[PDB]
């Protein structure tokens, strides 16, 4: 539970950093709706999980970069889901 459970860490770091950077990246862009920390976080979680609702997303270029970083380091990082392979015990 150390090799996997450790990923949960990385995930929470990404989710967090992603929210901050996203808001940072998106503000100043007319129409951007990804401009407040809280939902900025709701977004990152729905991006990492890739649930994909489409209720929030980036419009700027860096916003999309932060996005891609979150998706990659996030879909990967969701190796936490595999970590819950302990339900096979």
């Amino acid at each position, epitope marked *: 539970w150390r090799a996997a459970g450790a990923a949960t860490v990385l995930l929470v770091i990404v989710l967090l950093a992603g929210s901050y950077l996203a808001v940072l990246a998106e503000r100043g862009a007319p*129409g951007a709706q990804l*401009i*407040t920390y809280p939902r900025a976080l709701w977004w990152s979680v729905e991006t990492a999980t890739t649930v994909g609702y489409g209720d929030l997303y980036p419009v700027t270029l860096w916003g999309r970069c932060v996005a891609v970083v979150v998706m990659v380091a996030g879909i990967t990082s969701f190796g936490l889901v595999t970590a819950a392979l302990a339900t096979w015990f």
Partner: antibody
Amino acid sequence: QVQLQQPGAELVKPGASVKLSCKASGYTFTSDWIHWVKQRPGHGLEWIGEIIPSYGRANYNEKIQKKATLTADKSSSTAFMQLSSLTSEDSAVYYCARERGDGYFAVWGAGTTVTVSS
Amino acid sequence: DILLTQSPAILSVSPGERVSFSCRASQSIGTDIHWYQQRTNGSPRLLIKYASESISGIPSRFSGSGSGTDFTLSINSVESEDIANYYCQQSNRWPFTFGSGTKLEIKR
């Protein structure tokens, strides 16, 4: 205790420029945004721009003509708005406010009355 | 950018009565609307945030309602201390915007 301290007044001659201030106190985070709002006598509030001191980035209202340049100073917890080449039009009260990145302005400054006259 | 329509501009109510100021968005903004009070020569003062959420230090006389594009700030039993200018402000889409304003006016 009072959280945002703004100089009550500032006189300026047309074409000249003044650098307003706003010193903070109380709780501070890296998620804090300091905004500036212009208000001419009689009329309502007008967002001018915003800045994130814990990074330094600032965005400005694109509808109005840009007459300002925001800056901050982490240590002294002071935000500075530089208004350049002023005219009668620029005379008004300017408030600075603190926004916790959640969208609303919880606390505001007393505002600095600014007059552009000879 | 989002437009906040505040009409009527002036509201005339009798003491103790209930008063309602309305703010309409040019587009659906969920509940990202916030209310401020500003008395003659004072600075703005957060009254209600996120349309309904209360604020400490504010009379329970004050309340909010609405979602999308139609919002209402209410006062139960107005009174002299309530005479001011009320503004609505949104944080749904950048850049934040303000309502034109609505002056309360008590008739005694």
